[PDB]
Design a protein around this nucleic acid. Structure first.
Ligand SMILES: [K+]
Ligand SMILES: [K+]
Ligand SMILES: [Mg+2]
Ligand SMILES: [Mg+2]
Ligand SMILES: [Mg+2]
Ligand SMILES: [Mg+2]
Ligand SMILES: [Mg+2]
Ligand SMILES: [Mg+2]
Ligand SMILES: [Mg+2]
Ligand SMILES: [Mg+2]
Ligand SMILES: [Mg+2]
Ligand SMILES: [Mg+2]
Ligand SMILES: [Mg+2]
Ligand SMILES: [Mg+2]
Ligand SMILES: [Mg+2]
Ligand SMILES: [Mg+2]
Ligand SMILES: [Mg+2]
Ligand SMILES: [Mg+2]
Ligand SMILES: [Mg+2]
Ligand SMILES: [Mg+2]
Ligand SMILES: [Mg+2]
Ligand SMILES: [Mg+2]
Ligand SMILES: [Mg+2]
Ligand SMILES: [Mg+2]
Ligand SMILES: [Mg+2]
Ligand SMILES: [Mg+2]
Ligand SMILES: [Mg+2]
Ligand SMILES: [Mg+2]
Ligand SMILES: [Mg+2]
Ligand SMILES: [Mg+2]
Ligand SMILES: [Mg+2]
Ligand SMILES: [Mg+2]
Ligand SMILES: [Mg+2]
Ligand SMILES: [Mg+2]
Lengths: 134, 74, 89, 81
RNA sequence: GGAGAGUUUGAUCCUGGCUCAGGAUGAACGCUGGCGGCGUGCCUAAUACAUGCAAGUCGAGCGAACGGUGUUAGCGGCGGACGGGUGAGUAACACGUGGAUAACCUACCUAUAAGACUGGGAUAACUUCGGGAAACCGGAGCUAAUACCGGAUAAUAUUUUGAACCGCAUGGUUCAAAAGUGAAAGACGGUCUUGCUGUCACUUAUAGAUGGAUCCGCGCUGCAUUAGCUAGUUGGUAAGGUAACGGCUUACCAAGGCAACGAUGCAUAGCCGACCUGAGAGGGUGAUCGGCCACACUGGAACUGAGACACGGUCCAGACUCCUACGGGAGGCAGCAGUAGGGAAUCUUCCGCAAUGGGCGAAAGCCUGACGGAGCAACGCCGCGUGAGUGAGAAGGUCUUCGGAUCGUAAAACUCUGUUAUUAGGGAAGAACAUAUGUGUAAGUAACUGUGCACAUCUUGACGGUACCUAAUCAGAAAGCCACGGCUAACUACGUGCCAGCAGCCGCGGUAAUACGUAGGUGGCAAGCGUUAUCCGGAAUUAUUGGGCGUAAAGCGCGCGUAGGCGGUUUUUUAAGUCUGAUGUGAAAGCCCACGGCUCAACCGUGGAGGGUCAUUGGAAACUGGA
């Protein structure tokens, strides 16, 4: 555009959007209002664990339905081989969407709160909440 | 002593002191104007006259200037 | 009142002091009127006093009062003697 | 309330407030009386003005009013006198 | 001082988004964890708060009481408006920067001058009689002061007469020259003469210094799917009011004032120095340190005071909590700790006033959760370890084209070291003083005491028996984390068989998987290593620097035309833009350069540089603007 057009109507950058919107909101119970805080993880309670089929891929991918501490419902993936989760489990939820699973944008942290570490894991244990053997 | 700010402008009601505000990003000069409610004493000036004003102590809720001299008659 | 006093600088267990003219109500390390020197009590050999003598007498003659330590510093630099001599004369 | 010197300050404030109220009231009475006496040209309008000026100066010395307010009050009577 | 790569196709070149490699954090989480230094540590609930501490001091202002020269409660003075916390509100002269006040106030401090005369009456304490569970309240008497109040003296302050001179309009500086009017205090010492006199204190006046107040230019977030707003509103007169100007308030008069240069409304936000990122232009943030503002359970007021409409004061209203003997009473951690709650998440109910600073005091000193330190946490940065030298292919693991290869000089073996660690011995600085005691000198004195200044002697360390140093003994206690198809440094075997699982992207797995899981090996880092979240970069992907619109997204269907933007040649003139000096200012800390101290380094300190679209002022005249 012309300089005069830019003076009349300046440039405007596109607004960036967050990939984990449920983590960036808090809840004040006393005032019954939503805040904006940018948390790295959120506590939550498992409403419904289960499995889901992928979008070329084929498997039974384990996940849980979680009500986060800010009263938001999300689908969180359970990484690793075997888990100890069920209804009413207290879990820590972090960011990171799992491709091939539509509607699952978060991960459950292994080895935090009620979720156990992966059993028998020996490589990359810190990603799966497993203590060092022996 | 000390100097009080002086302006020159045109009466818009019986003073407009149009100035330039250079654009911060693009560098183009853009005209802007500010109306200075001023004290004329004996209602001497009229609409369109180009007048000189000087800063004074507050004279009313919005008057901070006194008309000192008329420059170009209406 | 107006004071000539020491504001603390440096780090833990390693104090360094600037000599400042400040309002008594100002916080120790905050707003000052004018710095007039430094003072290093932990230096290797000499406490390293660095007073601006012309500035110190202007404030002393203007009613600024030193703290106890600053009075000793100004005395060690002869400023207190010149202040008393100039007051009588 | 809680602090010993704050508790004492409540008492000394009340004592000062009682003295200040009396002296302000008397000073305002004399000023009003002197103001009226001017608006009618009484025989003792000079004595009433001198009394009002005396009390206004004593109030300013007592910090009951500012010196600037005392000067403003003094002029209003004296120009009208 | 500027790096790219993957991904649309059978293949291509474009366009275009997406993703990745970098830096950073008040981080959190997972696995792991040796030390030292320096820093940092409730970002959420301005949620509610148990308990302790965070503001006193002065007996050289005063009376009394109790004790044997001391002390207690009280009166009185000063302080409690600082220091400390927090960021709720605020889009505003709140803040930044630059100015103005001829419209301002200022305790304590300093200097100068003139004074400090003469009377009086209260009242707390206290004693006594009561009333109340308590908090506390009544009656009777008593009494002091540097408490309070009369009178005298004091004018630069006020009124009027004027005058001279000057300014930026209101005006201002003097010169008078009359009329009213305004103060004060003693304490502790010396000499003694009960007179004089020292220090501190007191009054008035004038300056200085300090602090505060008001006004103005410019700068300050979104939303127009917010376009009308205002009626004390805008101006005037008068009065009132204030430290002060002013619709600041009221009365009357007039109908103005603001707005498309965005008024108003809604939402969001304390602002700045700084901080992160970036080649820069920019973009992002305001925790910590410093400046300014605002707030103190919510809302409204005022009192005292130099200063408050007052965090640990008062009054009132409200919500809530606590005691009650039901009449009544009490409270406010956004001080330091600490608790509960919320949360992914953020510490000890520690030590000391030794240092610096502050209040009170003549001083000794007292007070000081400011502050100086210690404690906890790999939260960050920096430094040092977890051994070193020699040592030919041992066993064991893994692979094997069962020859071998590799882990690997790695291990063991031989010597060596003690940073660290343990035990013991020594052990700084940080401390300057003040007081007191002597001398000397200056002012003053009639002289002395005292005061100022100088020298000499004296006491004082929370940390802490810490840092550090010395000796002995031992490689003995001290390595983990992620990755290895490509981007991208580093590959093999076995198990599994589109399962289990992996995944930032391309995608991998359906019986010979370098991508799943494990193992060996390797790579990258290392007391850390990874993951997540968030911001800048890469992104020229909002393009001023630095992009586009025939067919990729993009020319309004087309006129007329308002505001605005832009505008042919020459001469003279101006000086707003432009250019070029001067002056002032842009605090300190920070960044960058230099140097110095920390064993180095972090860090600390010192000296510079930088940063304005800043203001004021002197020049130039080509270009833009004005005539
Ligand atoms: K393809
Ligand atoms: K102290
Ligand atoms: Mg020393
Ligand atoms: Mg530390
Ligand atoms: Mg907070
Ligand atoms: Mg609260
Ligand atoms: Mg006492
Ligand atoms: Mg005084
Ligand atoms: Mg008195
Ligand atoms: Mg806010
Ligand atoms: Mg760039
Ligand atoms: Mg008052
Ligand atoms: Mg207070
Ligand atoms: Mg409190
Ligand atoms: Mg607390
Ligand atoms: Mg919790
Ligand atoms: Mg001290
Ligand atoms: Mg105490
Ligand atoms: Mg950790
Ligand atoms: Mg490679
Ligand atoms: Mg993996
Ligand atoms: Mg296989
Ligand atoms: Mg792979
Ligand atoms: Mg694998
Ligand atoms: Mg390191
Ligand atoms: Mg980015
Ligand atoms: Mg970018
Ligand atoms: Mg393009
Ligand atoms: Mg075109
Ligand atoms: Mg098409
Ligand atoms: Mg098209
Ligand atoms: Mg067309
Ligand atoms: Mg069409
Ligand atoms: Mg260092």
């Amino acid at each position: 555009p012309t300089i005069n057009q830019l003076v009349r109507k300046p440039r405007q950058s596109k607004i960036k959007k967050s990939d984990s919107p449920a983590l960036n909101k808090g809840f004040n119970s006393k005032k019954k209002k939503f805040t904006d805080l940018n948390s790295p993880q959120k506590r939550g309670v498992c409403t419904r664990v289960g499995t889901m089929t992928p979008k070329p891929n084929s498997a039974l991918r384990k996940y849980a339905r979680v009500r986060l501490s800010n009263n938001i419902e999300i689908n969180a993936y359970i990484p690793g081989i075997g888990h100890n989760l069920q209804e009413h489990s207290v879990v820590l939820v972090r960011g990171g969407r799992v491709k091939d699973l539509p509607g699952v944008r978060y991960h459950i942290v292994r080895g935090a709160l009620d979720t156990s570490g992966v059993d028998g894991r020996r490589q990359g244990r810190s990603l799966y909440g497993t203590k060092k053997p022996k | 002593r000390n100097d009080r700010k002086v302006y020159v402008g045109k009466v818009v009601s019986d003073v407009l002191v149009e100035t330039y505000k250079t654009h911060k990003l693009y560098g183009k000069r853009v005209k802007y104007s500010k109306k200075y409610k001023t004290h004329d004493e004996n209602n001497s000036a009229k609409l369109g006259d180009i007048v000189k004003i000087q800063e004074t102590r507050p004279l009313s809720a919005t008057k901070r200037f006194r008309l000192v001299e008329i420059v170009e008659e209406s | 009142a107006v004071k000539i006093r020491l504001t603390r600088l440096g780090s833990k267990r390693n104090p360094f002091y600037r000599i400042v003219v400040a309002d008594a109500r100002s916080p120790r390390d905050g707003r000052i009127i004018e710095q007039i020197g430094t003072y290093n009590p932990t230096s290797a050999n000499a406490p390293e006093i660095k007073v601006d003598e012309a500035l110190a007498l202007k404030w002393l003659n203007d009613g600024a009062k030193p703290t106890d330590t600053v009075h000793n510093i100004l005395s060690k630099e002869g400023i207190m003697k010149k202040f008393d001599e100039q007051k009588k004369a | 309330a809680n602090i010993k010197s704050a508790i004492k300050r409540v008492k000394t404030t009340e004592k000062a407030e009682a003295r200040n109220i009396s002296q302000k009231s008397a000073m305002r009475t004399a000023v009003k009386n002197a103001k009226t006496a001017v608006s009618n040209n009484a025989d003792n309008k000079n004595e009433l003005v001198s009394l009002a000026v005396k009390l206004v100066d004593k109030a300013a010395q007592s910090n009951l009013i500012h010196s600037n307010k005392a000067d403003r009050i003094k002029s209003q009577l004296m120009t009208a006198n």
